[PDB]
Amino acid sequence: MVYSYTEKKRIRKDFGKRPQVLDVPYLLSIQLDSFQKFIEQDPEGQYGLEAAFRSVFPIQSYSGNSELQYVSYRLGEPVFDVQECQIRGVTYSAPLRVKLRLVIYEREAPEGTVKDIKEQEVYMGEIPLMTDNGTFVINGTERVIVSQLHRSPGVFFDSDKGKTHSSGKVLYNARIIPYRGSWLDFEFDPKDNLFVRIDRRRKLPATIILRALNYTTEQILDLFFEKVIFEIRDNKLQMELVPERLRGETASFDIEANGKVYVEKGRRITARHIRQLEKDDVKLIEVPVEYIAGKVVAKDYIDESTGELICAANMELSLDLLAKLSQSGHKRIETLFTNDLDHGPYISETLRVDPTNDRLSALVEIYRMMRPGEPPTREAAESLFENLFFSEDRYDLSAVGRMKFNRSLLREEIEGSGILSKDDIIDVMKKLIDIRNGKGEVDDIDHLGNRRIRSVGEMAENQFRVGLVRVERAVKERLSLGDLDTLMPQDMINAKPISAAVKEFFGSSQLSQFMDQNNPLSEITHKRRISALGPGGLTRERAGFEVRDVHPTHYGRVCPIETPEGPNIGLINSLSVYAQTNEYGFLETPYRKVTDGVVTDEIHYLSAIEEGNYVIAQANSNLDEEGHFVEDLVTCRSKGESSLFSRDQVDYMDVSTQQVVSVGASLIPFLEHDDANRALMGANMQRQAVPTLRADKPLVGTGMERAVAVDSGVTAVAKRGGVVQYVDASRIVIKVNEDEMYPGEAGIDIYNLTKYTRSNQNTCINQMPCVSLGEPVERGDVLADGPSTDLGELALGQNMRVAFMPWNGYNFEDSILVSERVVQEDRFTTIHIQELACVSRDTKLGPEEITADIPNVGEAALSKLDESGIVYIGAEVTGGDILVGKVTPKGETQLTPEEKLLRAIFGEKASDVKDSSLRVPNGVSGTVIDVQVFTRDGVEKDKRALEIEEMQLKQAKKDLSEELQILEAGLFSRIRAVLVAGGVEAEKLDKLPRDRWLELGLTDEEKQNQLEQLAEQYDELKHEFEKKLEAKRRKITQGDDLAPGVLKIVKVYLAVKRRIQPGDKMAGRHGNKGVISKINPIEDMPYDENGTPVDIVLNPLGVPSRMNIGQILETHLGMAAKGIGDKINAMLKQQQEVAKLREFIQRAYDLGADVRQKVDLSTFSDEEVMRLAENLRKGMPIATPVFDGAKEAEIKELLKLGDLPTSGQIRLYDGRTGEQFERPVTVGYMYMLKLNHLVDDKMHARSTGSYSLVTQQPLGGKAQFGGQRFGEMEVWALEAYGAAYTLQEMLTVKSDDVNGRTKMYKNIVDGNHQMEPGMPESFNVLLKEIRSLGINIELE
């Protein structure tokens, strides 16, 4: 196929011989999938709103004979649009419908029902939706929830050996963690007794809680233990033989088995004497009496003669007790094994130490342990034991609870009961007794097989379920109040719990947050993030050791490279490109199947548990056409390591080498060359790059960003593409082809481009058309580019000329040196859009009118402001100028009746003293974008917003009127087509309407049917179009919901052009980011043999120093790319024919060995790529894969083909002195980065400013005041320099002393130079606070 319509403009040259069979997924499918499964209707009852409604429902009061059955729910359409709602700045949520049905049962009468209750839907809460890009719209914010990672529910096997306990031995423990409710754990102590800890409470013995499970000691020893066999007939003392049950013996006498001695007295206990009686078949044997006293009794045997309780179970036997038991006529005797080799004497110390032998006293004791304040009344002990242990509501084992419970339980069926089971917890106690016995394997805490990610679906299901229970309580009170309630689900269900749970959840949460938007990159990699923060998964606020480490399970799913290099490290992760989430929350990664010796084309997704046992080959390997591997021993991995394995030991394949990296670090080329640390730093620096004016696609790249830019939702794509009709910067429309269309409604697809708009990062966003007109568009083609995007290809930075050189010491360490040429080329210039809102109103003194006067200010600002309205759009605001005038009532009336009706108050009318004006803060100057102000209902006499309220009506009327003309024009042309042969007239119909008078009469049928029809759908489309136009205009003029604490809201957008700056900062793809020392003239830049001064000058010492390899191959390969583009550009300077250049272009594509499917000239050869030569005339789009990237052989081969010297070094002359520098010099072209670190934003100079009423210290930075801060380190720095002055007057004169500032500024006059030492007022805040303290100190 290789159609490549949308990529025909720029075909990025790809390298490497490793094909990708599985294409890059939409990659947002975790949030999109979680959302589409969060709102769904299914009969199976999948997790979501249906699972919550089925969980709580039916809602029945206690002894009320009334139930509430769920009709489930259906979602409606929101009141606003996506982009329009974001512009309005109101939360975006759809109402919920399909209320639950009620029921009524007759009291004292079984099955009696008065009537069935089916009620109409009731409004409950508001359910927000998600944009196609994965965001959430609340109050005009981005509101994305970070993915969560924590422990998956199931039986845990933990080591938990304390290093601070000093014991030096491992203490095993196991804890079952349900999805909700209390936690149940077991705890060892050196006494070797199983203990139980529930919700941090003190650990009780196993015998008291298991006794609370109503199991007698006979069932304890007979259940958890084997009673073996003991038989006594006339004191024959015959017992069964268990030669394979123990290794050992102690023999003080001979023991004969079936007429032959198995082990002689004093004979060896070795396996020679063991297997003799073991391999042979032996039956019960008779041995003397002395062997009973050593054994421990198992079952409970009492004397048959009298009724005493002697010889109770779990007790030691005495020599004199044998005579009392054996002579009592007991039928059989059960004795405990109790020999420690592979086992241990568990539960014994629990039975002995446990005070409560019965379930009742056990429930009373666990109740007293649960509640310290109230003594147990024994009445509620059963409900506390059941609801605390095994119950439907308080368990919530969910899916992974029973899945992992049966997996570790070694069960068969996956589905199980959602509550605790006695045999299940007994199995946990038995297998845990095996863990204490030494057999079995523990589980790793950091192993992701025990971890499951949680998303918006499960989290919003949890909070929404909690709110639904909060509703179930009050509704239970309402149904329990009355005996019979007709039409109950009306006023009984309140929306405040739902709207508070979902609106408080998505509104305020640790995971839910707005994003800082720099390029689509930071938006998508900020959209996909793994967080151990929030509920669960957070061990401590700081430090930690094994939690922050990297497990082998971090290979193919989470990216170890991308990471929060700041205070918390190793917590936030990034999923793989091909990673996916399983049904239980587990993470699966692709592996290609291999059958016999050939590699089949099917790929299966495997989690950590499944891929742990299987062996998978290394990412890079040799492949043959027959499917077999070239090398016999192929590098493969099984568990926690990798080694060469045979061709028969490889189960699966890794496909691409990019599975271990993420979208953030995957766009950094030559990863295998560059060091992982500096690649981590660069990947951390990729997200802060601000978009610039002109986006130039990176000439060195990957080819993943092609899918990232289109899959990021930032660019404007096209649905059902076709022949483009009209284009514009505001709007783009396309005529859809007739290949695939809907039969109804006809019409064409229209698009509204977003203009310059403020982001959360105060950046500039917009989309620009990539097509001219009349160009065919396919499905999925990007029409317009977002910020920092060029032709659907992501470029967040700008290339520029590069030379490696020390220059006159102006480049030191990481310092950067920028030419004035790029300064003159407008490159790196960006727009910063800050928003200014003046909103007050709300006064009991009367309303506040906007503008119309500026009190106590001359006409200077009145020239900028309109008489009845605000300032002109796109004006110059400098300093403290008033952008939007606002007044206040203030004193209003007074004596001299409001100054004689505002006579002495001049023309304000308020009276005087209105401070409500906006008054733009100092230091911020720029041009305003648009004033959105506010829109309210029933508001009149507002000159502001009139132009935009009219502009919206003209816009919707324009673009809707286009479709109206397409419809009415189409049907009118259909009339002109049907009137043929029925009395047609070209000269008449081509100069008049009606169509000869509604197709005349013709043959009767066409008259009434065709004419009456034409009028029917004509007036139907006209009247319907006008009705929908009025319905839309009503939505335009109705406005939104304003905050009740204000009458009118005013908000304005302003923009500033900020370009390359001397201090600034710059960053590389490989992690070098530094400040610019000085911007040098063009004349001072060294030039080549052609006299081309160099744009940038960096420090080559940082390559060995900071271990940055990829900069050499970056600059050199870039010099090759711009060598191709430079030679082709020279061909355009010579005006060569297409074919002569076409040969060099084709050679440029296919040079090297394979490593691409692209073929030049394939399609017509005279267009497309032919014009793409004029597209790439500036530079060549060369791409390298992450680990598959280019090699120095092909790099020097291409660069040598570009006529450039193969060594990548050109003889250079000084731009200053003109003399030649000794030795060749490395030059090239690399991709650079402009950040938000510019020193207009970072640097603020301040002298004197506002202070605070607390201690008289100023607030701090960003207030245009304060001296920043010199902390205790600077206090000890002045004590270190030995200056008493600077420190003493430092802490005192500036803040704690007014006398120092007054006398200081007074001494500035004539320069007395003295500064008052003063008495610190902050020290008077210490003396003050101490005076508030009960010990008050006063000076003498």
Partner: protein, 676 residues
């Protein structure tokens, strides 16, 4: 929150003076408004304060001239926010530069520790007499050079100064120019004209010498020495008396900082101070003229790497074969394999170096003799501008092995150079251990800060009032003499300390009771009659002063010249700030600073200098086998030379069997006893 702050970001001015500020025009006149109002007042260009405010708000061009009149001698003090030691705040003389940033002296940047990665900057304005003039007579960057932590003057002429002076001073066989008869001004005509390379071997140009041995007068001299043209260029930097290309040139390495120290040893004011930056001007000047570069051809991959990796892989294959047979345990097999990959990595490093010097050749005439290597990697490694043999070992040779979670060396080594494609799992373990390194280096800052909190909280108590109270108590000064080689000489410890008695040599004469110990007297007693390494010297800890400390008893030194005065914090803040850089970063895995469990005397007792090894505080016990054992528990084993000075002395524990107890001799690296 202080006052009067620009809060700028550092830029690097190479030019102007070591102490001066590329204060910008934008940061200017914002904080200088009071001086501008008073300036227009006293000068009289304005009328009233409000009129001057109008003149400033209108941004007139006349305000810039008087603004310059104020700025030139009105200093600005500078500090980085994470401040550690006393030199963090320094006073410079500002001059306007167009821009939004501040151009800062890079040699001072190393003193601030600040980096150009974009760390913020706090810029404060001093107030009038005490601040401006106190920072003028005290806190200036040239007025404070010596650091009261290491004690040596702290200057970092690294990076393109080390590389530039390395390329400046060096020789080459053949090339062009041969020898030259011109001597003093050969750089102008010879270098700037044609035909003379920046460096040429075998040049007969004479160099004039100056002798300062005369009292208050310099004695000139001249003679013909063989020196390269670049060395003749470097000689023009300092007109004063020097070794004249012997110690004053060398290879263009840290020995340039050594000759900077010897030049600063005499008259630490003066053209010793001023024009010493000409080393920097020529350093970045002719370093930029050199234009060193790094590329694919720069690095060299040894061909022995394949044979070493293959041989080590075969040996380890035999090891895992023996483990498959059951003859070798898993532990000894693991540690053994670790040993083979470690020694093999060392082999790849050594062959890497061999191909770093002798593989690089230059073709001239027959080309068989070749010449010294011009490779930039070798210039950085040998010169010392940046990089290290370990980092280069990762560039070409093996990268080493570490595991953050396990803490042990992994059994899957990295066989791929950076130029070669790395394996996916190799990048996995590398980013693992690198993330661990980021966690540790990020963790050490807070712990070091807290350590400075405790130490500085203790150090506040020093008044340092009385001068000399005449105390007789002083510490006996003896060298550390630990291990095979002595760690530090006793001359550095006894240098610059008051001496009660301190008789060098066998008690002949040496120092008197009331004599101060300077560098000349202490160096004379250290060089002449060095057989006595123990001298009693007064210390700060022992002072007869009731309140405060005695400066004469503590010592004489500071950031400024010697003979310190009272009222100084001295070791309080100087030591509290001295301990900050030590704990700021751990050494390797931090187990180095810990007990290594392996020592010289612990394994095999060795001697430093050839001499008689004796046991101090011990009872010699001869045995029947002929060996010698110590009867007591705690003993001493020292190596005494013919002069009597102690070379190497280690405590001899009980149970050590030695071949010769006493009466014999020992050479360098001799092992008397060996105990497991």
């Amino acid at each position: 929150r202080v006052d009067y702050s620009g809060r700028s970001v550092i830029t690097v001015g190479p030019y102007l003076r070591l102490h001066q500020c590329g204060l910008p025009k934008k940061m200017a006149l914002e904080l200088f408004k009071p001086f501008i109002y008073g300036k227009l007042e006293l000068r009289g260009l304005a009328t009233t304060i409000k009129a001057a405010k109008k003149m400033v708000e209108r941004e007139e061009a006349v305000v810039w001239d008087i603004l310059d009149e104020v700025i030139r001698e009105h200093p600005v003090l500078l500090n980085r926010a994470p401040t550690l030691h006393r030199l963090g705040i320094q006073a410079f003389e500002p001059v306007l530069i167009e821009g939004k940033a501040i151009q800062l002296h890079p040699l001072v940047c190393a003193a601030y520790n600040a980096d150009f990665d974009g760390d913020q900057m706090a810029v404060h304005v001093p107030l009038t007499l005490e601040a401006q003039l106190e920072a003028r007579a005290l806190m200036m960057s040239t007025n404070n050079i010596l650091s009261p932590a290491n004690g040596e003057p702290i200057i970092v002429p690294s990076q393109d100064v080390v590389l530039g002076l390395y390329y400046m001073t060096r020789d080459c066989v053949n090339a062009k120019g041969e020898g030259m008869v011109l001597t003093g001004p050969k750089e102008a005509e010879r270098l700037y004209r044609s035909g003379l390379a920046s460096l040429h071997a075998r040049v007969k140009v004479r160099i004039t010498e100056y002798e300062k041995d005369a009292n208050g007068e310099l004695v000139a001299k001249t003679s013909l020495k063989d020196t390269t043209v670049g060395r003749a260029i470097l000689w023009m930097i300092v007109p004063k008396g020097l070794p004249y290309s012997i110690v004053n040139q060398a290879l263009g390495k840290k020995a340039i900082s050594k000759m900077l120290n010897t030049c600063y040893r005499i008259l630490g004011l003066k053209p010793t101070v001023i024009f010493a930056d000409q080393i920097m001007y020529t350093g970045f000047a002719y370093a930029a003229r050199s234009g060193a570069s790094v590329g694919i051809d720069d690095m060299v991959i040894p061909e022995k790497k394949h044979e070493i990796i293959s041989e080590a892989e075969a040996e380890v294959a035999e090891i895992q074969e023996q483990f498959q047979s059951g003859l070798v345990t898993a532990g000894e097999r693991y540690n053994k394999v670790i040993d083979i990959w470690a020694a093999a990595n060392d082999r790849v490093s050594k062959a890497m170096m061999d191909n770093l010097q002798t593989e690089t050749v230059i073709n001239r005439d027959g080309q068989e003799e070749k010449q010294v290597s011009f490779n930039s990697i070798y210039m950085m490694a040998d010169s010392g501008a940046r990089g290290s043999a370990a980092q280069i070992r990762q560039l070409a040779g093996m990268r080493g092995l570490m595991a953050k979670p396990d803490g042990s060396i992994i059994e899957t080594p990295i066989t791929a150079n950076f130029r070669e494609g790395l394996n996916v799992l190799q990048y996995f373990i590398s980013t693992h251990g690198a993330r661990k390194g980021l966690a540790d280096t990020a963790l050490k800052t807070a712990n070091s800060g807290y350590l400075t909190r405790r130490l500085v909280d203790v150090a506040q108590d020093l008044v340092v009032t009385e001068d000399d109270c005449g105390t007789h108590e002083g510490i006996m000064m003896t060298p550390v003499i630990e291990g095979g080689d002595v760690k530090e000489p006793l001359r550095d410890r006894v240098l610059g300390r008051v001496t009660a008695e301190d008789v060098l040599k066998p008690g002949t004469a040496d120092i008197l009771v009331p004599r101060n110990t300077l560098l000349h007297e202490q160096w004379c007693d250290l060089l002449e009659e060095n057989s006595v390494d123990a001298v009693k010297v007064r210390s700060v800890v022992s002072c007869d002063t009731d309140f405060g400390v005695c400066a004469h008893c503590y010592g004489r030194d500071l950031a400024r010249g010697h003979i310190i005065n009272k009222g100084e914090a001295i070791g309080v803040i100087a030591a509290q700030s001295i301990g900050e850089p030590g704990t700021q970063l751990t050494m390797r895995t931090f187990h180095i600073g810990g007990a290594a469990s392996r020592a010289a005397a612990e394994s095999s007792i060795q001697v430093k200098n050839k001499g008689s090894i004796k046991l101090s505080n011990v009872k010699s016990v001869v045995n029947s086998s002929g060996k010698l054992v110590i009867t007591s528990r705690n003993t001493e084993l020292k190596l005494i030379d013919e002069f009597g000075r102690t070379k190497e002395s280690y405590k001899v524990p009980y149970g050590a069997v030695l071949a010769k107890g006493d009466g014999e001799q020992v050479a360098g690296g001799e092992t008397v006893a060996n105990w497991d």
